[PDB]
Symmetry: D3
Subunit: 340 residues, 6 copies
């Protein structure tokens, strides 16, 4: 957990994040050409950052956002496929792990159902070792089919990694889910468009803190014909302090070393802010002093989670009362989104 | 949701938060004397802030922290009791609602079990309308008996209010639970000691954003013989932007107007960042476009919450593997906290 | 007055501001081509921001700065004209109002007098509803003919709008003049070159506060052969707090919702910081308590404004004593600017 | 215009500002005792800051705020009087100029009309050389009789000084009026209570910039039974950059050196941001190039100022349409302030 | 190197720094009484921070600044002496190391020469293990006799510690000297008075970076009759990033864990920003590639240091040409400091 | 020392710094073409900044970084040479001094030894008046031959200038060496790649303060195939306060006026923070009061500098004990850098 050098040691994973300029593409050939530009970038970056063990690119960095539905279906990727092979070759040549984005990934029922929005973690031998599908697409605008699962994978130097995508990170539940599965680094890849710049910078830091986890964010930059993306790719320590952060600049890079021993030492020995531990051992001091054993209280005291798990339809009905009953609003209608 | 004036309107709730200097007390008589100082402060503040509808004091602002166990038991409050009556009279005289702290509140089995750490919301007629007991005491140091329930109460001008305490706010689950019960303002009262100043400032803002809720924080200040408290009492908008924030100064005050219509308009009409709505209607656009109905997906996709709700002991066992198995650590032992 | 979403409601005007990359143009054909790029950008942005009701482009975003005098005269626009028709079509297609820049607009005595530096507000039906000519050109460098009038126009959802340009905003008088005419949003369009980046960021916020008015700023970006423009387009609340702000990035966008009801509620009910009201009712409490009626004092107590209005030549003579008597300085001479 | 040292030179005026802790006083004897504490503080500060030429205390630093009307009248000061003599002796002993606050100063018709809220500038020989009465009392709460005049006085080393008070500084007109009278330093003394902390910090800087003037702010601190005062006393350069700024701490001090030659050199030779010059020579380049002489345009183009000067009652009527017609609001009533 | 918890581990040294309120004392009895208050504070802090291994108090925290020469001599301490014994007992009772200030420490020729300004490092067994005398007193105001030596001492858990005082830290040479002796933590104790608040915050961070060293700063707070002290006690990582920082509040505390293994791993394996290594192996890559061996260049290329070491009188003469020849200036005279 | 205007006076040097976009070049013809682009930029900037007296471009702005060894040797420049003549013509035409980068400059033994990394200062008559070779190349990556000398040159309006390059600025010794030679402005030209953005921003400010010197930084921007450069070109006052600073934007420019009289007045009359003076007159007050003469102590008290000057090999051996013995590390090997 230290910032400023280009090296890494047996204790540290050298992580690079990329403010990748958002592509404006339309065809499979264009996507392939851009995939090879990403590959060239990985290999060049390694020449400058000899400590690099993990390189992270934004959501949409391969395809851009395929606004046209026909182009969306025509450019939807197979995984593994040609794009991933191109990335895998760069990971091998540069002896680094990498996180890349396929938007979309063909649905099982392609082309009759919406593609997934997908991340892969590729190891330094070119093997895909995690494939994550976005659980919370950025509706209403995003039409991707939602995924349903988080994963944890042993990463470079044994650092445990989970992937999440963009809108996912607004929801503290996903970060919690990953950390509770044992994640030591949560990688948030995004094409996060303005307006919500400051909110997203703050969210990543707050989630690093709340879940005692390293966080790396790669966010797109530039204007793509529709959105302007605000960058601020970052690596953040498990104590909630930014290691390094980019500005809004096209193809900015940040690089930091995250210590394997430090996070494990903290998770073992931290007390007042060992949030993962404390959530499942509430009021331990009080119970000890009250003659009630030495483990605190594990039981979930929050009705929302009990209801959501038991009766998701009831939780949905409850939230519609507080918000609205239809996915769209007649005050700001969107074609294909019902309202009223 | 606006800041800078001392007024309030039929649309806005005028909220004041107090950087109350942490008392260093030892006896019931001293606690009573300090309760009357708080009462005098409420009445004086109202003279300067004619818009004030809600005034918020820090956790521990009534008793301070009773480090001595005998003094802790001797000063534990009844609710309702003498302290609350003193506060209630000030709320009536100043025609304001108030949030006050009783640390401790007598356990049902007093003095044979640890007291609770408790907040009350008192209305402008002097009636206690919410009583909240801290669900996550700040272990290891805090020996309070943990509470088990969150509440929502109709507040001034119909603004829906939930109370939480200090360490509670590190855990996104509690903020979620309150907002999903319909809370429009979450009031976090704290005696939040250094070190974790910047982390706590960031958490409140991030939670305001994540849960589309107004947030008010009152935090103690000064040195009490053991801890120094970092202040930064604040009122924050539902869009994650600070309204007003104090520094670390003793008896600082902030004051802001929170609009009832604005939060309700947002919760109805916001789309891309309507987090409460979107969490229970995931990927609605994708499902519509895939011919699968117009509600998105409600089901909880996060195994941690499913496991915690179904089998809290399993969730506890899982987290002990990632952290440690005993509440204490032999590397930093604490008397009365078992380890090793 | 809220930030982070892409929606808007019947209560809120969705405002987008654009960090438009400064063009480097030389011919009428090039200007037309760039006008169509702006039009394409408006239509694309609306696809991503369905709440958008108003889109704002920087001063000079259509022509760039025509440094060459011959090119300046050759590219000076008619209003209405071809450029405005191109913009009007985009406003109609995207169902949004827009603010666009014509630099220059032909003088009545074209080509024998300097063109104006002009903004138009175009409604969602493609109609020009305000035309503003820069009252304070950025002399010495800017050679535009000064305008003489501010305007207020009913805008989207009835939001009252005034336009001002770049250097204008350094002078608190213009913001005052607009707000006192009833403006609820002041739109500052600029091609504000470095050096004065931080000063301009601060000015917009301070003027929002001082005049209890929403402020939107669109500023150019990039290097154009002569100047580098610092971006930081922004939308600011009437309470002086930034809603959203861009960085220095080319073609950054910000977007915020400004509430019609909130500003009107504030202007009615705010007291201590109701600056528009208080300026014309000074010391009302004192006069009441002194038996002198209940309106305070309206009379202007500032000799500078009395003198400027009555005897502008005297005010000019007075200021020349404090500064210098000639428009140029021999210590930093500029061709065509007399000194010495 | 430089910060960090305790010295001053023949070119620089050493200015100290004081975050003076707000007194809570009730009697004339208490006021006198506090005046002598201020005097002792002046003499001590000079021992530590040998460059000090000017020392500035907050509005209300002598009396505190006399909330009780009877006490207000009983403690209203004569000027010159006992309090000013006490201050004058300290200025002589410490060989410094000083700015002090008398709240109230007896009205000409004392005790039958409200006192003034007054500042004095005392020179190093103990002579009162400026007496300023607050033109914009902070209504509704403040009941002081409004003053009607700004002043400029030759200060230490010939630095030209104007005094303004607290609420005055929210109104850009007063800063303009002082600078146009030739002020080189505007001293804003305040007892500026929370909420509006960030807005006031920003205002002082923005006004320094807009009027090309040094600014010194002394603001009170602490809680006085009614308000908490936010400090942030500051000295700011004529280029809008803070020299030094205090936090919210009780009895904080800042100290900076302001160069006489620098401001005079700037006012002579600055061009693009010579705001005082440019306001009265608008569009000079354009007029030259259009064959219309070399002075630009002086005439006031802002109808608000023309109307206010000619017909203040009309300006008042106009603003009441935009705000409200009565000084009070029935939505937030205040005893003695009419509404409805 | 992590922040937020109250614990520490076998790998981390738990460091607390104290914003100690500056005493205003006059007699030996008063100094002793205050020393016991510091002792009580150490023991209380340990109850709240069970990880604490090192506690740091400001320069002057024991005596305050003895402005009166007679009182200065009467209160000058012996080391070891009564004050240090009081501190030593607290270190033993709280099982912590501590850094304390003796101002003054009796000169060898007391009372005929000025006392030293001195820090002691006391271990958890109550033994004084380092005594440092300020090498750069804060002249002209400070009249302490200058010390001449820096030290490095094995500290808690083997962390190597050097002490420096206040004004010392403005001079990069002292930080370099300590780090090159092997220091892993440089402790800067200060009574750093306003004006130079922001400069001092920045210096500590910059020196942490430049010397790849942990830095802890304890600074005084409050007003002492002459100066106001700006606090901002801090612990900073060897990568230049703040761990935790106080504000200006009286008796603020910060606490952070500094990893022994992290700094040693960095000093071994860092490359591009291994400043200690690189300074003595300049251009190693270039020399290798030029066929000139594999060590780079060690020789000092800076004439100033060569001259200062060889001919300090020449270096002094050189600097007097750039500045002034006498220690005082007639433009800002100070009694006892010659000028002219 | 003032910021915001485009003018300059007889007292001020108008300094422009350029966030020049990093070139990606391969051939001599490409370098020449880019040199002419820089020349065109100088002439254009002068049209917009009539006060400009000095223009500063980043290290590598002429060649980019020649990663290919063959291309490095093929494009190594003669000085004076074709590139410098191109720059000299622009300086003459625009009547400005300029700082330009030649990377590499041919070694005396070209092409058999590594080129130098070189800056030239060219006056307004096109004459090269300083040539500086980087003393601390950014090893391990940079293979330039190290230079050995700093210089001071009389610059525009007599302002004394020293040049340093990029990695040089991490080492406080070089800034000290320049200031002690009489430098009034230190110009740091850099191609400073991410990661170390915040550290470099802080270093420049801290060095301005520590050495009481103006500082100008020009840093590259953009991605060049290997590194992304973080911009933040800046001009900083001798009191450590930023005048103007760029963001990370490609071809950003900042411009500020630095006063000749202000720095000379400060160096003469400053006392408490006259660091250049005080370093060579330590404890003057103490020695005076102790009867030991009126000059303080000049002797160097820091063993590191004494050892480095006398026995550089010993200093190297000492530092290898604290860090590592070989220039490379087997934990992060780099081809051509020995380790193990």
């Amino acid at each position: 957990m230290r910032h400023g050098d280009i090296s890494s040691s047996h204790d540290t994973v050298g992580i690079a994040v990329v403010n990748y300029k958002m592509p404006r593409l339309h065809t499979k050939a264009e996507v392939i050409e851009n995939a090879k530009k990403i590959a060239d970038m990985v290999v060049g970056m390694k020449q400058g950052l000899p400590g690099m063990d993990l390189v992270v690119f934004p959501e949409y960095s391969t395809m851009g956002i395929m606004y046209d539905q026909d182009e969306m279906f025509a450019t939807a990727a197979s995984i593994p496929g040609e794009e991933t092979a191109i990335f895998a070759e760069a990971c091998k040549k540069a002896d680094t792990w990498g996180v890349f984005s396929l938007t979309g990934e063909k649905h099982e029922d392609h082309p009759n159902k919406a593609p997934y929005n997908t991340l892969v973690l590729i190891n330094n031998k070119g093997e895909i070792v995690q494939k994550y599908r976005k659980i919370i697409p950025w509706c209403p605008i995003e039409g991707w089919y939602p995924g349903d699962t988080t994963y944890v994978t042993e990463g470079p130097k044994g650092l445990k990694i989970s992937l999440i995508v963009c809108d996912d990170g607004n929801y503290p539940e996903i970060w919690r889910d990953c950390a509770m599965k044992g994640a030591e680094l949560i990688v948030r890849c995004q094409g996060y468009m303005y307006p919500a710049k400051e909110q997203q910078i703050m969210m990543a830091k707050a989630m690093a803190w709340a879940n005692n986890t390293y966080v790396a964010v790669a966010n797109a930059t530039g204007f793509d014909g529709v959105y302007s993306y605000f960058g601020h790719s970052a690596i953040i320590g498990f104590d909630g302090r930014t290691l390094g952060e980019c500005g809004t600049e096209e193809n900015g890079i940040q690089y930091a070393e995250v210590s394997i021993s430090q996070i494990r030492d903290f998770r073992k020995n931290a007390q007042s802010q060992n949030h993962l531990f404390k959530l499942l051992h509430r009021g331990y001091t009080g119970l000890i002093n009250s003659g009630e054993g030495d483990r605190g209280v594990a039981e979930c005291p929050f009705d929302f989670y009990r209801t959501w798990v038991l009766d998701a339809e009831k939780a949905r009905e409850n939230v519609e009362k507080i918000t609205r009953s239809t996915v769209g609003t007649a005050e700001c209608p969107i074609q294909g989104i019902p309202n009223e």
